[PDB]
Design an enzyme around this catalytic site. Structure first.
Site, PDB file in Angstrom:
ATOM      1  N   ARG A 267       0.813  -1.238   0.000  1.00  0.00           N
ATOM      2  CA  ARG A 267       0.000   0.000   0.000  1.00  0.00           C
ATOM      3  C   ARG A 267       0.833   1.269   0.000  1.00  0.00           C
ATOM      4  O   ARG A 267       0.273   2.320  -0.381  1.00  0.00           O
ATOM      5  CB  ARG A 267      -1.007   0.062   1.157  1.00  0.00           C
ATOM      6  CG  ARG A 267      -2.169  -0.916   1.111  1.00  0.00           C
ATOM      7  CD  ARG A 267      -3.264  -0.665   2.102  1.00  0.00           C
ATOM      8  NE  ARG A 267      -3.989   0.593   1.851  1.00  0.00           N
ATOM      9  CZ  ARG A 267      -4.899   1.124   2.675  1.00  0.00           C
ATOM     10  NH1 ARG A 267      -5.194   0.502   3.813  1.00  0.00           N
ATOM     11  NH2 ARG A 267      -5.523   2.284   2.434  1.00  0.00           N
TER      12      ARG A 267
ATOM     13  N   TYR B 252      -1.406  -3.803  -5.681  1.00  0.00           N
ATOM     14  CA  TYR B 252      -0.525  -2.644  -5.849  1.00  0.00           C
ATOM     15  C   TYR B 252      -1.486  -1.431  -5.729  1.00  0.00           C
ATOM     16  O   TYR B 252      -2.386  -1.358  -6.584  1.00  0.00           O
ATOM     17  CB  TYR B 252       0.145  -2.572  -7.240  1.00  0.00           C
ATOM     18  CG  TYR B 252       1.459  -3.331  -7.345  1.00  0.00           C
ATOM     19  CD1 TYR B 252       2.671  -2.745  -7.028  1.00  0.00           C
ATOM     20  CD2 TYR B 252       1.458  -4.626  -7.804  1.00  0.00           C
ATOM     21  CE1 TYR B 252       3.868  -3.434  -7.156  1.00  0.00           C
ATOM     22  CE2 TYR B 252       2.641  -5.369  -7.938  1.00  0.00           C
ATOM     23  CZ  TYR B 252       3.848  -4.731  -7.643  1.00  0.00           C
ATOM     24  OH  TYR B 252       4.943  -5.528  -7.836  1.00  0.00           O
ATOM     25  N   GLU B 253      -1.314  -0.546  -4.798  1.00  0.00           N
ATOM     26  CA  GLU B 253      -2.161   0.634  -4.659  1.00  0.00           C
ATOM     27  C   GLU B 253      -1.780   1.736  -5.652  1.00  0.00           C
ATOM     28  O   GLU B 253      -2.650   2.402  -6.279  1.00  0.00           O
ATOM     29  CB  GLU B 253      -2.141   1.221  -3.238  1.00  0.00           C
ATOM     30  CG  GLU B 253      -3.266   2.233  -2.991  1.00  0.00           C
ATOM     31  CD  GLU B 253      -3.576   2.634  -1.573  1.00  0.00           C
ATOM     32  OE1 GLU B 253      -3.809   1.732  -0.740  1.00  0.00           O
ATOM     33  OE2 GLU B 253      -3.645   3.798  -1.199  1.00  0.00           O
ATOM     34  N   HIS B 254      -0.492   1.968  -5.830  1.00  0.00           N
ATOM     35  CA  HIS B 254       0.102   2.997  -6.697  1.00  0.00           C
ATOM     36  C   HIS B 254       0.638   2.502  -8.024  1.00  0.00           C
ATOM     37  O   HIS B 254       1.667   1.811  -8.101  1.00  0.00           O
ATOM     38  CB  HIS B 254       1.191   3.719  -5.841  1.00  0.00           C
ATOM     39  CG  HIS B 254       0.485   4.478  -4.733  1.00  0.00           C
ATOM     40  ND1 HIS B 254       0.362   4.087  -3.416  1.00  0.00           N
ATOM     41  CD2 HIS B 254      -0.212   5.655  -4.891  1.00  0.00           C
ATOM     42  CE1 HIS B 254      -0.362   5.034  -2.805  1.00  0.00           C
ATOM     43  NE2 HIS B 254      -0.716   5.969  -3.661  1.00  0.00           N
TER      44      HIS B 254
END
Length: 289
Positions: free
Chosen positions: A87, A131-133
């Site tokens: 995150r 995967y947040e980004h």
């Protein structure tokens, strides 16, 4: 079969609230129960670009191979999947070399997965992409697509359940991936606690959910809630609206299951008088009944 219930664990490496996988929320009689163990995280070069070489970032004394063996000996029907990505802004999807990323990721993940074995075989049933980004649709959809294909085709592994974990802000990149690999992705775990604007009513919840099924596919989207204090502070959705909204879905037989962000954070009651795992146990009651 059964409604799906999934719980993230291992994702708070500094937390001491748990010393093993909780059994209080484990129900394999009326639900299909999954533990999502994570984070397997890549190493990054000094440029902030990813190598594709994954390593376990969860506490292996508490949730390592011997603890997974024990869990599975006692509750064989529980599925254990590994989540990759992370995150933080410090763990983005941004490969340094597009044609070598996939081989490093396949090899390093297979090495990790092979540690989680017993006398009777591998204990891992799948992988979760979290995967947040992610900055663009591509090379994400192509490289993640190839990684899923390679792992599903490896006969040494049992990668049977594949899931993705979008949020409102990265959904367009996950949609690209889902459209390309729809047949290999079983579950879309959408996190309602990450919405941009607050979800104010159970009707607003329902309306969001229906639009997600159009963006992905009906019956493959599982709504999620976060009990993490970082998320509680953002206040994008309250547990009352989450329960209310899920109730509406259950009434028209439209909720395939749910997922929670995280076992470490749900063990500690937020309001005096609250039992540990109050939100999870409430959802289990509504999914059976």
């Amino acid at each position: 079969p059964k409604p799906i219930f999934r719980e993230y664990i291992g994702v708070k490496p500094n937390s001491t609230t748990l010393h093993d996988f909780p059994t209080e929320i484990i129900n394999t009689e009326t639900l299909e129960f999954h533990y999502i163990l994570g984070f397997a995280i890549e190493s990054y070069y000094e440029s902030g670009k990813g190598t594709g070489t994954f390593e376990e970032s969860w506490d292996v004394e508490l949730f390592g191979p011997e603890k997974v063996k024990n869990l599975k000996r006692r509750h064989p029907e529980v599925k254990v999947v590994i989540s990759i990505g992370g995150r933080g802004v410090n763990t983005p999807f941004d490969p340094a070399e597009e044609n070598v990323w996939v081989s490093n990721a396949k090899e390093s993940l297979k090495l990790i997965i092979q540690k989680y074995s017993d006398d009777s075989g591998n204990l891992i049933d799948g992988i979760d992409i979290h995967y947040e980004h992610i900055r663009s649709d591509e090379p994400f959809a192509t490289l993640m697509g190839q990684l899923i294909t390679e792992l599903k085709k490896d006969d040494d592994l049992n990668i049977n359940v594949v899931s993705i974990a979008p949020s409102e802000n990265n959904s367009s990149h996950y949609q690209k991936l889902y459209n390309a690999k729809k047949d290999y992705i079983n579950w879309v775990d959408y996190q309602f606690s990450n919405q941009q604007k607050p979800v104010s009513t159970d009707d607003a919840f329902v309306e969001i959910f229906k639009s997600l099924e159009k963006d992905y596919h009906p019956h493959k989207v599982l709504p999620g809630f976060s009990t993490d204090p970082l998320d509680t502070k953002h206040n994008k959705i309250t547990r009352d609206i989450f329960i209310g909204g899920c109730t509406r879905l259950v009434q028209t037989f439209s909720l395939p299951g749910v997922f929670f962000w995280n076992a470490n954070d749900s063990v500690i009651p937020k309001r005096d008088g609250d039992k540990p795992f109050i939100v999870e146990l409430t959802l289990q009651q509504l999914l059976a009944a």
